[PDB]
Design a protein around this ligand. Sequence first.
Ligand code: RG5
Length: 167
Amino acid sequence: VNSFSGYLKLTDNVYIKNADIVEEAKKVKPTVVVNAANVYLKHGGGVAGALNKATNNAMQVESDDYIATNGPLKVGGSCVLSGHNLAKHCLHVVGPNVNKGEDIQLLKSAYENFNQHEVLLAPLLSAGIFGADPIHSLRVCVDTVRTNVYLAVFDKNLYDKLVSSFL
Ligand SMILES: Fc1ccc2c(c1)[nH]c1ncnc(N3CCO[C@@H](c4nnn[nH]4)C3)c12
C-alpha cells in the first residue's frame, strides 16, 4: 500500500491521473519524482521548468554543479539528484526531443531508467514541449516499465484521450 490517490489503473504496474506533477509531488512526497530533463539539466520550461520553480531554483543550482563535474547526460540517460521539497529523490530522465530531431527509438531507453526504482511519480517522457505523441509515449511506457509508475498528466483533455484510446 502506498499514498497515491485517485489514479486509474492501466495495467498490473502502470497507473494514470489528471494532475499537476508539482502539486502531486508536494502532497505525496514520493520517494522518486521523474523530471523531463534535457542533457544539460537546463530546467527552463515544461515539466522541468515547473519542478525547478517549485524548488525555488535549488534544483537548478544542484544541477549546474552536477553538470560542471560530470558533463551532459546522454539522450535516453538519467541521473539521480535530490528531490528537494518535492520528493526524496528526483530522477532526471532525458527523452528524445522531436523538436531537435533526436531518434524516437531512444524513448524506450529513456523509460528503462524507471526500472531502477520500485515506485515512481512521473510525467510522460518526450510529451509536451519535447514534441512526441503522448499516446505513443504511454504505449512505450507500458511496454517498457516493469516497476510501479504513477503518471501525472497535466492537461485534462489529453488524459481523457489517453484513457479512452488505451489498448
Ligand atoms: F508548468 C508546467 C508545464 C508542464 C507540466 C506541468 C507544469 N506539470 C506537468 N505535469 C505533467 N506533465 C506535464 N507536461 C505537460 C506538457 O507536456 C509534457 C512536457 N513536460 N515538459 N515539456 N513538455 C508533460 C506537466
